Design a binder for these strands. Structure first.
Ligand code: CA
Length: 744
RNA sequence: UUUUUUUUUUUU
C-alpha cells in the first residue's frame, strides 16, 4: 500500500499543529495502523483519526482565542528587565532569574511566558515550595488579568485541583510535579517549566533540578527557567551547561547591621531591646529557636513589665487563630518572639527592627546513630541576611546581630541543602520506581555522601522494598517495594499499611499512618496546659499511643456528622484541636483508602485487636524497638543507642520492658515520641531478614540423643530471646558431628 | 510521686 501511506504521511505532517499530549497518542496510534492487514480497514481508521485529529487541531485554535491581554504593573522593577529576559527565554532553553524581595518576578514570569506564546500547545508549570505560595501566586496573577482563579490561571495542590481546559499557567507545589512524573515521565503536559524559590534547596527542589537536567535531551521543544533569590545563582547556571542569568532589583528600604556580641544569652537580648527603644518606638522581631526558648524569653520580657508593650509569640504549631492574631492591627508596641516561620514562610507585617541571636534548630541525619538529630546551631550568612531582610518592609530599618562580625564572616555562606542531611530512603525508592537505579549516575546539583545513600538502601531492605539484579549499584524494587511507592506516605508507614492486610486492621492502620503524617492535631497551648491535657487524655489507651488516634478519630468522625459545620469548628476549639489538621488527617486517610482499594487490599469493617494493629505497625518500626533497663526508666534501642520515653506519652508513667516508638529524635536526650507496649515474641516472625543467631554452651544430652546449646537471637543488638535450649544437631548437623569428633 | 517536652515542610 503506497497510497495508504500518503494519507498516513500527510496526516502526521498535519499533527504538528496539536497539543503535545495529543501529538504523542496519535503518533503512536498511527504507527500501529499499518500492522493491520486489510487496506480497506486502514482507509476506515485514517478517516476516523483525521476526524479526531480535526477536533484536536481545532482544540488548540479555540484555545488561542482565550489568550488574555498582557499587563505589567509599572510598580515592579521586573517590568523594566522584561524586554531583556523575553529575548533570553526564546533564544535559550534554560534561563535563570534571581531577584531581591521586592522584584515581583514571581507574578510576572508566567505573563512573559504567555506573551512569548507558551501555554497554548502545552501548559506552563509554576512550582512553589508551600501550598499557600502556589495558591496566593495563582490568585494574584488572576487578579492582575481581570480573570478569576481556576480559569486561565490555575493552581493544583494535594487536595485542590483548580485547573480548567482553558488553563495556561499551572501553579503547584514542587511535590505535585514530582507525583506527575510517574504517570508522565516526559512531562508532555507542559510547554515550559518555571521552578521558583529554588534557593531554598529543598529535597524536592534538588531532585527536580536533576530530573529536568536528564530529560532536556528527550524534550527539546520545552524550555525551562529556574528562579530564586540572589543567593548562589551560579550553581544553577553551572548545572544546565552555562545557562544565562538575569538579576532584578528589589523594593526594600535600606537596612543597617549592628554587631553586638554578648542568662548571658537572655541579658544580651535585654540590652538590644533597650537600645532600640531609644532610637524609635517601633516593633521588634526577635528570632527564637524553640518553644522552650520562646517561653523563657517571653516570661523574662513580661517580667520586666514595660509600660507600652505587648509580648506576642509566633511559632509554627501555634493555634491558627492565635497565629493570625499577629496579622490584625498594630496597637501600642509589639515585640514578636518568633522562629523560622518568620524567616521564610510567614513574613510578619509591620516590622521596624529585628534582633538576630543567630541560632536555629536544624534537622540532621546521624549516619552513626541512624537517628534524626535536631541540634541548635549558628545560622548561615544567608540565613542571617534573610532574617535581616524581614525588617526593611515599609520604612527604613536597622538589624542588630547578637554576635561578632568575625563570627558572621566565619560562618558558611549558605545552609546545607536538605539532600545532604536527611535520609534518602524515600528518595531512592521513588528513583527506582522511575527506573533510575544508578544513584551515582543521576545528575544531582549537590551529590549526597555515598555512605548516606547506602543508609537509605539498608532501610529499604529493612522494609523489603529493594533488591539488586546481581549488579554493582543499580537496584530493582520488589513487588511490595512498588506498592510502597504507590502510597503517598512515609516508607515506614507505607510498610505497616501493607502488612496491615495480613491481619484484620487496614482501617486502623490507615488511621494511624495518616495521623503520623501530619503535625499532631491535638493542641497544647502555652496557657491552660493542664486543662488541655484533661481534654486530650479522654482517649489515652493504657498502653498504646497509636490507639489514641483511633479513639480520637472515631470521636471526631462521629461529632463531624452529628452537628453542624460551624458547631464542629467550635467543638475543635473547645477541645484544643486544630480544625484544619483534623480535616487533613481525614484527607490523607481518604487518599490512602483510594490506593489501598485500587491495589485490592480489603479494608475491615470490624474493630481489630491490640496485637494485630500493633504487629502491623511493628513492621515499619523494627529499628525503633527498645528494652527497658531493670530498675531504670531508660530504654536500650537499636544499635547501642539509649532513648527515653517522651513525657507527653500515655505510657511514660509505667514504661514496659519492650516498646516500639514511631519516631526517634535527639535533642538533649533520645526521645521516642509515639510509643506502645509490645511483646518481644512478635519481633521474631517479622525480622527474619534481620535476626542474628548465636549459639552457646554446646553439650551432648543423652535422653534426646543429640547435641544441645543455648541460642540468643539478636535484632540490631537486642536480645529478643535471651536463651532457649534447642537441639543443635538439627540446626547444623555437620558442625555437631565435627564437635562430637573433636570431643567438645 | 522513679524519667518532664521537637526546626520547617512537600505527594503518587
Ligand atoms: Ca477543574
Amino acid at each position: 500500500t503506497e497510497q495508504q501511506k500518503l494519507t498516513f504521511t500527510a496526516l502526521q505532517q498535519r499533527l504538528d499543529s496539536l497539543m503535545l499530549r495529543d501529538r504523542l497518542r496519535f503518533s503512536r496510534r498511527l504507527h500501529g495502523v499499518k500492522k493491520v492487514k486489510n487496506p480497506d480497514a486502514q482507509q476506515a481508521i485514517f478517516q476516523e483519526m483525521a476526524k479526531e485529529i480535526d477536533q484536536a487541531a481545532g482544540k488548540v485554535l479555540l484555545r488561542e482565542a482565550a489568550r488574555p491581554e498582557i499587563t505589567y504593573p509599572d510598580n515592579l522593577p521586573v517590568s523594566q528587565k522584561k524586554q531583556d529576559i523575553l529575548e533570553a527565554i526564546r533564544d535559550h532553553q534554560v534561563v535563570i532569574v534571581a531577584g531581591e524581595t521586592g522584584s515581583g518576578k514571581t507574578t510576572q514570569l508566567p505573563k512573559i511566558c504567555m506573551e512569548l506564546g507558551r501555554g497554548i500547545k502545552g501548559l506552563i508549570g509554576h512550582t512553589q515550595p508551600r501550598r499557600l505560595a502556589a495558591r496566593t501566586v495563582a490568585n494574584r496573577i488572576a487578579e492582575e488579568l481581570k480573570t478569576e482563579p481556576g480559569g486561565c490561571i490555575g493552581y493544583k495542590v494535594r487536595f485542590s485541583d483548580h485547573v480548567s481546559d482553558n488553563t495556561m499557567v499551572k501553579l503547584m507545589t514542587d511535590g505535585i510535579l514530582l507525583a506527575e512524573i510517574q504517570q508522565d515521565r516526559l512531562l508532555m503536559q507542559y510547554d515550559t517549566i518555571i521552578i521558583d524559590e529554588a534557593h531554598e534547596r529543598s529535597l524536592n527542589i534538588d531532585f527536580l533540578l536533576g530530573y529536568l537536567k536528564e530529560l532536556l535531551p528527550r524534550r527539546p521543544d520545552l524550555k525551562i527557567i529556574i528562579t530564586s533569590a540572589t543567593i548562589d545563582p551560579e550553581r544553577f547556571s553551572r548545572h544546565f551547561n552555562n545557562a544565562p542569568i538575569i538579576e532584578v532589583s528589589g523594593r526594600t528600604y535600606p537596612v543597617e547591621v549592628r554587631y553586638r556580641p554578648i542568662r548571658d544569652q537572655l541579658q544580651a537580648i535585654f540590652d538590644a531591646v533597650d537600645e532600640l527603644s531609644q532610637e524609635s518606638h517601633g516593633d521588634i522581631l526577635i528570632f527564637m529557636s524553640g518553644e522552650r526558648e520562646i517561653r523563657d524569653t517571653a516570661d523574662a520580657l513580661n517580667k520586666l513589665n514595660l509600660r507600652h508593650t505587648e509580648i506576642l509569640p509566633l511559632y509554627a504549631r501555634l493555634s491558627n487563630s492565635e497565629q493570625n492574631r499577629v496579622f490584625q492591627s498594630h496597637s501600642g508596641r509589639r515585640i514578636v518572639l518568633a522562629t523560622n516561620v518568620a524567616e521564610t514562610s510567614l513574613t510578619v507585617p509591620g516590622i521596624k527592627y529585628v534582633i538576630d541571636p543567630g541560632t536555629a534548630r536544624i534537622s540532621r541525619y546521624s549516619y552513626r546513630t541512624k537517628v534524626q538529630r535536631l541540634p541548635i546551631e549558628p545560622i548561615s550568612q544567608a540565613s542571617a541576611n534573610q532574617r535581616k531582610g524581614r525588617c526593611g518592609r515599609v520604612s527604613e530599618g536597622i538589624c542588630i546581630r547578637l554576635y561578632s562580625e568575625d563570627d558572621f564572616l566565619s560562618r558558611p555562606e549558605f545552609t546545607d541543602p536538605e539532600i545532604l542531611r536527611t535520609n534518602l530512603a524515600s528518595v531512592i525508592l521513588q528513583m527506582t520506581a522511575l527506573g533510575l537505579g544508578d544513584i551515582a549516575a543521576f545528575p544531582f546539583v549537590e551529590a549526597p555522601d555515598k555512605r548516606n545513600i547506602q543508609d537509605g538502601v539498608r532501610l529499604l531492605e529493612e522494609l523489603g522494598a529493594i533488591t539488586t539484579d546481581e549488579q554493582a549499584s543499580a537496584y530493582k524494587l520488589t513487588p511490595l517495594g512498588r506498592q510502597l511507592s504507590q502510597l503517598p506516605v512515609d516508607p515506614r508507614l507505607a510498610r505497616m499499611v501493607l502488612e496491615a492486610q495480613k491481619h484484620g486492621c487496614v482501617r486502623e492502620a490507615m488511621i494511624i499512618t495518616s495521623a503520623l503524617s501530619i503535625q499532631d492535631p491535638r493542641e497544647r497551648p502555652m496557657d491552660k496546659q493542664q486543662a488541655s491535657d484533661e481534654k486530650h487524655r479522654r482517649f489515652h489507651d493504657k498502653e498504646s499511643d497509636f490507639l489514641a488516634f483511633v479513639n480520637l478519630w472515631n470521636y471526631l468522625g462521629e461529632q463531624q456528622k452529628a452537628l453542624s459545620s460551624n458547631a464542629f469548628r467550635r467543638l475543635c476549639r473547645t477541645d484544643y484541636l486544630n480544625y484544619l489538621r483534623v480535616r487533613e488527617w481525614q484527607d490523607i486517610y481518604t487518599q490512602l483508602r483510594q490506593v489501598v482499594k485500587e491495589l485490592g487490599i480489603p479494608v475491615n469493617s470490624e474493630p481489630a485487636e491490640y496485637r494485630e494493629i500493633h504487629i502491623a505497625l511493628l513492621t515499619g518500626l523494627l529499628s525503633h524497638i527498645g528494652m527497658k533497663d531493670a530498675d531504670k526508666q531508660e530504654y536500650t534501642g537499636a544499635r547501642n543507642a539509649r532513648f527515653s520515653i517522651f513525657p507527653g506519652s500515655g505510657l511514660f508513667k509505667k514504661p514496659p520492658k519492650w516498646v516500639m516508638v514511631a519516631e526517634l529524635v535527639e535533642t538533649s536526650r533520645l526521645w521516642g515520641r509515639i510509643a506502645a507496649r509490645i511483646d518481644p515474641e512478635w519481633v521474631e516472625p517479622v525480622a527474619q531478614h534481620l535476626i542474628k543467631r548465636t549459639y552457646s554452651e554446646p553439650h551432648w544430652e543423652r535422653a534426646q540423643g543429640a547435641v544441645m546449646a543455648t541460642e540468643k537471637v539478636t535484632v540490631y543488638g537486642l536480645p529478643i530471646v535471651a536463651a532457649r535450649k534447642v537441639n543443635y544437631s538439627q540446626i547444623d548437623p555437620a558442625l555437631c558431628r565435627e564437635l562430637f569428633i573433636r570431643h567438645a
